[PDB]
Amino acid sequence: KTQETVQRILLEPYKYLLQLPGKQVRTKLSQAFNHWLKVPEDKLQIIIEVTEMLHNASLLIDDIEDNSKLRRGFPVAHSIYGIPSVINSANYVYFLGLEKVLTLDHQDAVKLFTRQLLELHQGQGLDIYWRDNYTCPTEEEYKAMVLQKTGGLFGLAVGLMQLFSDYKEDLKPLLNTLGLFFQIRDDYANLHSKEYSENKSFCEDLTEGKFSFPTIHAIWSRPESTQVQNILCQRTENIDIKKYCVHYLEDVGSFEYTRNTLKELEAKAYKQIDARGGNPELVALVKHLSKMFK
Amino acid sequence: TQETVQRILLEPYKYLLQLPGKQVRTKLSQAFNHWLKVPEDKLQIIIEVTEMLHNASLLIDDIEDNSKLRRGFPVAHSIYGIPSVINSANYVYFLGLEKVLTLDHQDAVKLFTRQLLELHQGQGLDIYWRDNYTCPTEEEYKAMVLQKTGGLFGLAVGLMQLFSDYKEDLKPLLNTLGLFFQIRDDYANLHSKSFCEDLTEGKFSFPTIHAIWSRPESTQVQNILCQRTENIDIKKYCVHYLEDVGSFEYTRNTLKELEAKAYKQIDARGGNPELVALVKHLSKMFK
Amino acid sequence: TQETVQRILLEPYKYLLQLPGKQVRTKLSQAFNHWLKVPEDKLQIIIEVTEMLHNASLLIDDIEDNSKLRRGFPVAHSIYGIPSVINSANYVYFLGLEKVLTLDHQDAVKLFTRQLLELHQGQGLDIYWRDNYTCPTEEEYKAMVLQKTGGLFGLAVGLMQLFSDYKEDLKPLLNTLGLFFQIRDDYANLHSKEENKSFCEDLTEGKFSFPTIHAIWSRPESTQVQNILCQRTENIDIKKYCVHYLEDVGSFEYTRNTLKELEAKAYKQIDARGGNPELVALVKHLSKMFK
Amino acid sequence: KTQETVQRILLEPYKYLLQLPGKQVRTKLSQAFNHWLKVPEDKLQIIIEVTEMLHNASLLIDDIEDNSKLRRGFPVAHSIYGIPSVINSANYVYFLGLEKVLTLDHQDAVKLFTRQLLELHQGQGLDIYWRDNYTCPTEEEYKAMVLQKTGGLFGLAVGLMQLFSDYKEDLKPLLNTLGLFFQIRDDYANLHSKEYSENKSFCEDLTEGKFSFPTIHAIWSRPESTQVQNILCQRTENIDIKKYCVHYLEDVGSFEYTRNTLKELEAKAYKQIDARGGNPELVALVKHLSKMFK
Amino acid sequence: QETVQRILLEPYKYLLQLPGKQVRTKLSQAFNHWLKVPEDKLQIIIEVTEMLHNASLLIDDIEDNSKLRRGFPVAHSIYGIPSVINSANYVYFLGLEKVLTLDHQDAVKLFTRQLLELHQGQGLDIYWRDNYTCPTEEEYKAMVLQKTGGLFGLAVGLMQLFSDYKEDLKPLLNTLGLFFQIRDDYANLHSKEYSENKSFCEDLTEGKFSFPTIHAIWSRPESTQVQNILCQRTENIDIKKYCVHYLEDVGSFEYTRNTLKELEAKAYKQIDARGGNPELVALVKHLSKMFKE
Amino acid sequence: KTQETVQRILLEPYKYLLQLPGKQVRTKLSQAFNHWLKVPEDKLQIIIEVTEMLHNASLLIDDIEDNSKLRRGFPVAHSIYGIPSVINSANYVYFLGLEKVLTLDHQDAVKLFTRQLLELHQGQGLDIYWRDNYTCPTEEEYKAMVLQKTGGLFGLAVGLMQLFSDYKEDLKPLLNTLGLFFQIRDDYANLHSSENKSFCEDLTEGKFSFPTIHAIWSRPESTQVQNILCQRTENIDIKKYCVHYLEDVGSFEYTRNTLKELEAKAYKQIDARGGNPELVALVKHLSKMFKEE
Numbered sequence A, D: 001k002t003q004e005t006v007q008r009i010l011l012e013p014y015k016y017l018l019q020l021p022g023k024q025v026r027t028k029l030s031q032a033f034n035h036w037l038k039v040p041e042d043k044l045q046i047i048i049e050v051t052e053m054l055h056n057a058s059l060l061i062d063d064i065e066d067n068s069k070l071r072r073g074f075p076v077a078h079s080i081y082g083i084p085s086v087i088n089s090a091n092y093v094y095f096l097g098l099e100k101v102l103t104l105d106h107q108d109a110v111k112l113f114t115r116q117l118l119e120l121h122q123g124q125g126l127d128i129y130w131r132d133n134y135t136c137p138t139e140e141e142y143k144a145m146v147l148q149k150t151g152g153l154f155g156l157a158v159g160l161m162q163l164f165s166d167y168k169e170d171l172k173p174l175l176n177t178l179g180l181f182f183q184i185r186d187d188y189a190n191l192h193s194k195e196y197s198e199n200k201s202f203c204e205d206l207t208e209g210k211f212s213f214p215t216i217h218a219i220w221s222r223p224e225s226t227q228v229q230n231i232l233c234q235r236t237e238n239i240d241i242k243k244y245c246v247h248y249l250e251d252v253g254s255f256e257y258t259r260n261t262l263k264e265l266e267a268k269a270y271k272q273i274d275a276r277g278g279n280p281e282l283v284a285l286v287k288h289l290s291k292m293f294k
Numbered sequence B: 001t002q003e004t005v006q007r008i009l010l011e012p013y014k015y016l017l018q019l020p021g022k023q024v025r026t027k028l029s030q031a032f033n034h035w036l037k038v039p040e041d042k043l044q045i046i047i048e049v050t051e052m053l054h055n056a057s058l059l060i061d062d063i064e065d066n067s068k069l070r071r072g073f074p075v076a077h078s079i080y081g082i083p084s085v086i087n088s089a090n091y092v093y094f095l096g097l098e099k100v101l102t103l104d105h106q107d108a109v110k111l112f113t114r115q116l117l118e119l120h121q122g123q124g125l126d127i128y129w130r131d132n133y134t135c136p137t138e139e140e141y142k143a144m145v146l147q148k149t150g151g152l153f154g155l156a157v158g159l160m161q162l163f164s165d166y167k168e169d170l171k172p173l174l175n176t177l178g179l180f181f182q183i184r185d186d187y188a189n190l191h192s193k194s195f196c197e198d199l200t201e202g203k204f205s206f207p208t209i210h211a212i213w214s215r216p217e218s219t220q221v222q223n224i225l226c227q228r229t230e231n232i233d234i235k236k237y238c239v240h241y242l243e244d245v246g247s248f249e250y251t252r253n254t255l256k257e258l259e260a261k262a263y264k265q266i267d268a269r270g271g272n273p274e275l276v277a278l279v280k281h282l283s284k285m286f287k
Numbered sequence C: 001t002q003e004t005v006q007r008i009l010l011e012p013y014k015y016l017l018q019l020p021g022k023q024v025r026t027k028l029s030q031a032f033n034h035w036l037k038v039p040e041d042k043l044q045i046i047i048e049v050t051e052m053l054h055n056a057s058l059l060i061d062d063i064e065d066n067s068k069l070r071r072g073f074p075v076a077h078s079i080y081g082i083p084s085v086i087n088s089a090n091y092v093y094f095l096g097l098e099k100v101l102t103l104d105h106q107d108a109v110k111l112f113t114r115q116l117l118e119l120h121q122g123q124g125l126d127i128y129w130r131d132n133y134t135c136p137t138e139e140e141y142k143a144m145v146l147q148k149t150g151g152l153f154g155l156a157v158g159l160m161q162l163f164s165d166y167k168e169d170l171k172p173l174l175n176t177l178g179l180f181f182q183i184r185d186d187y188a189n190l191h192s193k194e195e196n197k198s199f200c201e202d203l204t205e206g207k208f209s210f211p212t213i214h215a216i217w218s219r220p221e222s223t224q225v226q227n228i229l230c231q232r233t234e235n236i237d238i239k240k241y242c243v244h245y246l247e248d249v250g251s252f253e254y255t256r257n258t259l260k261e262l263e264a265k266a267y268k269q270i271d272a273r274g275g276n277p278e279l280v281a282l283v284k285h286l287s288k289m290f291k
Numbered sequence E: 001q002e003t004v005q006r007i008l009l010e011p012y013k014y015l016l017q018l019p020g021k022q023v024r025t026k027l028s029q030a031f032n033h034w035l036k037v038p039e040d041k042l043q044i045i046i047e048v049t050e051m052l053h054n055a056s057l058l059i060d061d062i063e064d065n066s067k068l069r070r071g072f073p074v075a076h077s078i079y080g081i082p083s084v085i086n087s088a089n090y091v092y093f094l095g096l097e098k099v100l101t102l103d104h105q106d107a108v109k110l111f112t113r114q115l116l117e118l119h120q121g122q123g124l125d126i127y128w129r130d131n132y133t134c135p136t137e138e139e140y141k142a143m144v145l146q147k148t149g150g151l152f153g154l155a156v157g158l159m160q161l162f163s164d165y166k167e168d169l170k171p172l173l174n175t176l177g178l179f180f181q182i183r184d185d186y187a188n189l190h191s192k193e194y195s196e197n198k199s200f201c202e203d204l205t206e207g208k209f210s211f212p213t214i215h216a217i218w219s220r221p222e223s224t225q226v227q228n229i230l231c232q233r234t235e236n237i238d239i240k241k242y243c244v245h246y247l248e249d250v251g252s253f254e255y256t257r258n259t260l261k262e263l264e265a266k267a268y269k270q271i272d273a274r275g276g277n278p279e280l281v282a283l284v285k286h287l288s289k290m291f292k293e
Numbered sequence F: 001k002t003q004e005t006v007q008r009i010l011l012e013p014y015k016y017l018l019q020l021p022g023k024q025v026r027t028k029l030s031q032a033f034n035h036w037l038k039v040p041e042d043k044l045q046i047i048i049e050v051t052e053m054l055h056n057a058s059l060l061i062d063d064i065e066d067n068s069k070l071r072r073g074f075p076v077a078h079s080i081y082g083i084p085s086v087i088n089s090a091n092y093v094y095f096l097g098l099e100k101v102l103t104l105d106h107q108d109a110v111k112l113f114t115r116q117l118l119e120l121h122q123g124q125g126l127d128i129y130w131r132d133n134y135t136c137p138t139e140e141e142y143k144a145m146v147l148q149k150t151g152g153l154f155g156l157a158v159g160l161m162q163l164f165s166d167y168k169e170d171l172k173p174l175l176n177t178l179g180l181f182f183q184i185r186d187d188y189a190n191l192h193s194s195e196n197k198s199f200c201e202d203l204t205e206g207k208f209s210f211p212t213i214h215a216i217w218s219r220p221e222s223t224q225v226q227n228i229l230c231q232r233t234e235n236i237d238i239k240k241y242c243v244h245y246l247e248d249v250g251s252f253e254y255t256r257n258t259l260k261e262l263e264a265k266a267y268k269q270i271d272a273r274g275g276n277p278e279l280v281a282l283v284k285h286l287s288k289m290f291k292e293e
């Protein structure tokens, strides 16, 4: 009882994040991949749970590292329970996720767990490095980073599923395109949506001072102006300053450029699904997510 | 190569390696090896894993405790920033797990998970009580310390036990030692980190817990802890009060009692001159 | 102009007189006079005395509560500063005692002292619970409200009874109305956003109001409310989450039913004292919020 | 059992200030003035209690209005229990003091309590007015206010004692001289004393931004400079700015002027005491208090 | 060459995107109807004026802690206070370099004189505000005539150095200076309808004594509200809305409008006494449209 | 009328800085160079005042741009009178100094004044740009910037003197060596100690000074210094750590040797112009900072 109550007190920040939207995409994603994997439901429930645990845990930590205010329209967990509480709680879930990952009875599972998490930390580390050392990455550099940030859990889930699946053709190429698709879509939405209130508040990325795909464009597209770089350094919440930044980004074509990149990423993804036999479920998701641009 | 990433991510950890402390961990490892006698090949990995996880947790704890100094050095997030150190410290955790996967023992990762979760339970209660303003009892407090310290204490000795025919119980001594360390650390943080950094943290340390429960007609300590202030005089006031209600003598008396329990447990396990000397060296503070 | 100092010290108080509220106080005094039938010379003194202390206490309360708006107006310390408002509000307390010394009744200062100490006890517990992070129970809260509100209510009605032949006990109703008023205030400060205070200013104060108290004890598996209250945050998004939780746990319905029950109980008490058409109407008007 | 527990919890901030030194000086004052008033111990004890209670409550409120950090070497009560709690507690003691005055069985006590209290608040208001409205007063204006701030509590004690005394000789002139002597000595010490935290912290008056006797001199003595006014507006805790201000005050002779004013106040007190029959106890007190500016 | 000038002139380039050059241009045209300045000199004078004028607004925004100018973020809100300080002072001396191309022995003399006048005006405005000393109406106007007269006199004065028109225009320049500032003061507080220039009642957040506020302060000396609100330098929308309600209720806005209406009339008469200026008359009529509502 | 009260109000921050030590070195510097230029005392006196005004004015502005707390042991002027007043006051003195330069009666004086001031603003801008855009410069880039920051006022003084001197030999190389000597010596003291600024105020400013610059490039495997500079922290313990790091990577030793080299080069340059015992003594006295004994 004391143990179960003491645990309960510690998992509260995680319980809060469970109320946020997102499981739908995670659930649909797993189903889409199983059209190829045909993996036992018994193991999947574990892998599904493990993925949800590690994913939400990373988002709890990410909100702290990004000084974000809103997530999926909800206050971020550390806005309520406090940063020291959420840090320990999220880290508790990491090793709770290993405990569940220790039940797949596959000797190669723990290896994939460790590898995928270290890969995830590499990406987040680089994003935090560039932002907090005021060094804008190049378009190529940014893309490389997300492939480790997104690729960490994408490969963790898909990989653990493949451990008990007879499908064995390489799925890393498609996962990378999707990882790009999600983050760049995330970047486009965080700055192009006004009061849609889909996930975060108005241009929360500018207040974080982070380098997202649109801002990265304007920085290199227009090396004759240092406006964006200076505005990001301010890490300000001033709406007028943020509104100016967005107008400039449109004027330099950063938003139009991002849309075409997102539009291009969708096309490549379609081919990758088709080259693996086709995935009516996975193909459908992309079309739904593609409603954001144009 | 792209190996500049590892350097970038491990810089905050590399910074903390410059701090004193490895001597105590090494001497502790050697002292327990007089009984465990683990093959050096495995032992080498065990020490590395222990040092990584210990330092990695200490990076995170300083963030959770809003601490300013550690063993006389600035905290890592005071230099590299909280976001970077968080990612780096979590990075080292899982690098440490990778290293445990080189011990080639089916029960190694099992001990790893259990001990690590045990540490998080201890930290959680320490954080929960402090951030929900509910001072624990001595029993509740000591019970928490037994998991916080026991997390890393049992990890090392446990991993050492994984490759040793010495199967005698060291947990009583491990629990006595973990208690000894924290209560000792609590005592030092207030009787000697910057001036009373624990008071600025607002944490319930062993000395403060005594006065809170000892003289319940005053809520002074509780309120001072809630302010989480950096005022030297306010901090100076608290320690004088703690001293006047005997909170420090009580901590010393508990420490002196803890010292005896360790000595008796050491002799009851055959004796460990290296260990006994180490404890004696640490026991000089409450003399 | 001789001691123009009075003007300097009374400026914050004059600022608060511009705020709505006197109507309820006037109508309340009128309703009770239907039973007490107080001499106009004495009643007028009591009315001023009541207004002074009531406004003075609200000035102090706004400071202790870090409030931003009162009845749609900036709080006085938002303009003249916290030190000035403290001194002036304490000045008005003791100006009121001077005025009570004109009621001639030897027991007036005694009534004044007791009623004021009771009000300070109520505010103290409200402050104690909030600033020592210990949520009270419903009974504990209600006991406190009966001391906070009972302080000025009993002083007014009490002073009137000193010069009245109606010697029947009115304290049960005074307590019922006091709870009614505070619990009604608690409901609105969180159920609306406009009018009086700003959006959920009580959550930013971190104080335990009736709706929050319910949610805290109703669902002991969650510490959200406690933690949100500890943040003393001004984030609208966090506050919107808090009310949503309060609504989803039924704390708002519980407050309405508690208020509706208090309204009914009041009616029973009014009739038991002969009936008071004026007072019955006041209650009915104030009850329109629970819909 | 209950309610009395509430009184204890609500009176704690007051109990904390009782640990502070000072009761001795208040006690010696009561004894010294009673050499003339010869008040019955039955009444005197309450007058002493009423005086001590209201004074400490006023010092609690004063510390909040003055953003003070230390009083008599101890942290200010609101630095421990918080401003909202101390306010309610001090005002609670105010009316607790009134309850005590209702035990003198003299009907003119309630009048005196009211009058002296209103007088004190007038002084406090003006001091706060000048400071928070950035309007330095004249020397005459400052002294006029001090006679109301000190006289409020001074007149309460001596006056209440005189209600039960056959003396009936006019003592207000002496109380006024003592009132000035006390404040000007406080003003001088808060700025001239070493970094020695005997009462308040280093030049806490400059951080308060208040117009104390020394600063008042420099402002009018040298009207070609706005240094002092500008430093007081900053309300800084910068040691270097504060040390510079004291350097300026010394160079314009403000500290010497304050000493000479205090030396005169002491001399006048001797003459005033002599004119009322003499008071060896009071003479000893002033001589002891005068050792600081000598 | 390594013209690092671009890096240093970036904050200045940022402010050129703001509206305003049109009004400065129309003023030049209106006054050239009398002065008839040679085109070669006039073009430079226009450039010198635009440089020094924008440079002063860069410095002023820092001194006034403003948030918006002409609907745009203030330059130091992006590039930072240290950069804009150095950049605006750089442009001052770039303007001096330019004024030396008029080849007039008195141009630098007039330049120095006019800039010192502007700093006297700016200093007094800053002095009263940061020493919490409200000026009297006459005192306020005297400062405005020095603040505005600084650039007004530099432009027209430099033009007159190359003009056969030698009639005194300073009386008209003073009227226009007052008209400009008081119009600005009124708009910053009465035009809550739009964020066309500054943000909502930024003058109250600056704590400056503007014409509307000055009236209420002296008109109602039994109240210290305005003074106290200005001392708070608060960004509270509710406190600001209260101040405007108070200002309107004591007639400070009506008083300001009547003063502006009078300044408009005086300007028309002064223009006619100088021969008439259809161009200038049109500008005043257009600028007078804000308070005629 | 006769309101020199405005002047007092506007010049109070400037008069405050005159109480600070510093005039002595400037006086000795003027004397050392007059041993070659031999300028009429009437012209010399004006040149000295112009230099004193412009130099002090820039330091008032510089302290604002550098968030400095102390100067020469005294609080910075804006810590007392406020940033807005000091900015306006300091810019006022610039234009007062221009007025004074108009009294040297040389047709090229204003030209030299303008040119030198633009150069100083070029240097300061580069210093601020690197700091507020978090991009450490190279040693060569830094040295080039210092030649414009110091060169502005060094060349203004010496340049103005040479306008009234028959000594027409080139002093810019020596002027540049001394400019570097002065800045790098200040950098050394701000971290290793000069009874000037507060403890490692340069770390709190986040500026790239010569010692820090070394550590940045000397050990490029570490981002410690850059990150510490970005924190813009006032923590004495963090500052003390940086100093330990700087010493352990040899940044202080490298700075000392660079200064010793500048000292020798200065002596060689001085001898090359005929010798200057006065100037040689100044360098020797200032060089005691980087000597063990």
Ligand SMILES: CC(C)=CCC/C(C)=C/CC/C(C)=C/CC/C(C)=C/COP(=O)(O)OP(=O)(O)O
Pocket: A026, A029, A030, A033, A051, A055, A058, A059, A062, A066, A068, A127, A149, A150, A151, A153, A154, A157, A158, A179, A182, A183, A186
């Ligand atoms: C295939 C199955 C069964 C599940 C999918 C596995 C999943 C959901 C992997 C997560 C995909 C992803 C994009 C992970 C990134 C996690 C993370 C912490 C991203 C941080 O991105 P930021 O842009 O820095 O922060 P925001 O999300 O607030 O924008």
Ligand SMILES: CC(C)=CCC/C(C)=C/CC/C(C)=C/CC/C(C)=C/COP(=O)(O)OP(=O)(O)O
Pocket: B025, B028, B029, B030, B032, B050, B054, B057, B061, B062, B065, B067, B123, B126, B148, B149, B150, B152, B153, B156, B157, B178, B181, B182, B185
């Ligand atoms: C015995 C062998 C072979 C090795 C030693 C094994 C280890 C690492 C022992 C260390 C035990 C210990 C003291 C663990 C504490 C971990 C932790 C979370 C400390 C944080 O404690 P706080 O209460 O926050 O106070 P400090 O910040 O001063 O640490």
Ligand SMILES: CC(C)=CCC/C(C)=C/CC/C(C)=C/CC/C(C)=C/COP(=O)(O)OP(=O)(O)O
Pocket: C025, C028, C029, C030, C032, C050, C054, C057, C058, C061, C065, C067, C123, C126, C148, C149, C152, C153, C156, C157, C181, C182, C185
């Ligand atoms: C004359 C008659 C018949 C009645 C007089 C009417 C009076 C004086 C009523 C007072 C009743 C009341 C509600 C008193 C409250 C006083 C007080 C300290 C209010 C502040 O408490 P909070 O809990 O902070 O609520 P608010 O912040 O909304 O004010």
Ligand SMILES: CC(C)=CCC/C(C)=C/CC/C(C)=C/CC/C(C)=C/COP(=O)(O)OP(=O)(O)O
Pocket: D026, D029, D030, D031, D033, D051, D055, D058, D059, D062, D063, D066, D068, D149, D150, D153, D154, D157, D158, D179, D182, D183, D186
């Ligand atoms: C004469 C007898 C028998 C008794 C007198 C006992 C008392 C209470 C005398 C009053 C003495 C006095 C100086 C009262 C002043 C009241 C007060 C709150 C002054 C505070 O003014 P500040 O300028 O803030 O100075 P401090 O904050 O340093 O105290």
Ligand SMILES: CC(C)=CCC/C(C)=C/CC/C(C)=C/CC/C(C)=C/COP(=O)(O)OP(=O)(O)O
Pocket: E024, E027, E028, E029, E031, E049, E053, E056, E057, E060, E061, E064, E066, E122, E147, E148, E151, E152, E155, E156, E177, E180, E181, E184
């Ligand atoms: C007549 C010709 C040919 C040209 C005139 C062109 C110009 C620039 C005339 C000067 C116009 C003017 C009013 C200048 C004042 C500059 C200044 C320092 C304004 C600052 O006043 P604030 O009170 O700060 O109000 P804002 O900050 O909103 O501008």
Ligand SMILES: CC(C)=CCC/C(C)=C/CC/C(C)=C/CC/C(C)=C/COP(=O)(O)OP(=O)(O)O
Pocket: F026, F029, F030, F031, F033, F051, F055, F058, F059, F062, F063, F066, F124, F149, F150, F151, F153, F154, F157, F158, F182, F183, F186
């Ligand atoms: C040579 C003769 C005849 C006279 C002396 C002429 C002068 C005053 C030369 C001054 C050279 C010098 C040191 C110029 C630098 C001025 C400046 C803008 C310094 C600011 O740079 P910082 O690095 O911030 O210096 P601080 O550390 O003092 O703030």
Ligand SMILES: [Mg+2]
Pocket: A062, A063, A065, A066, A127
């Ligand atoms: Mg992130």
Ligand SMILES: [Mg+2]
Pocket: A062, A063, A066, A068
């Ligand atoms: Mg994020």
Ligand SMILES: [Mg+2]
Pocket: B061, B064, B065, B123, B126, B127
């Ligand atoms: Mg901890």
Ligand SMILES: [Mg+2]
Pocket: B061, B062, B065, B067
């Ligand atoms: Mg800690």
Ligand SMILES: [Mg+2]
Pocket: C061, C065, C123, C126
């Ligand atoms: Mg309240």
Ligand SMILES: [Mg+2]
Pocket: C061, C062, C065, C067
């Ligand atoms: Mg309230």
Ligand SMILES: [Mg+2]
Pocket: D062, D066, D127
């Ligand atoms: Mg005071």
Ligand SMILES: [Mg+2]
Pocket: D062, D063, D066, D068
């Ligand atoms: Mg005081």
Ligand SMILES: [Mg+2]
Pocket: E060, E061, E063, E064, E125
């Ligand atoms: Mg301005």
Ligand SMILES: [Mg+2]
Pocket: E060, E061, E064, E066
């Ligand atoms: Mg302005």
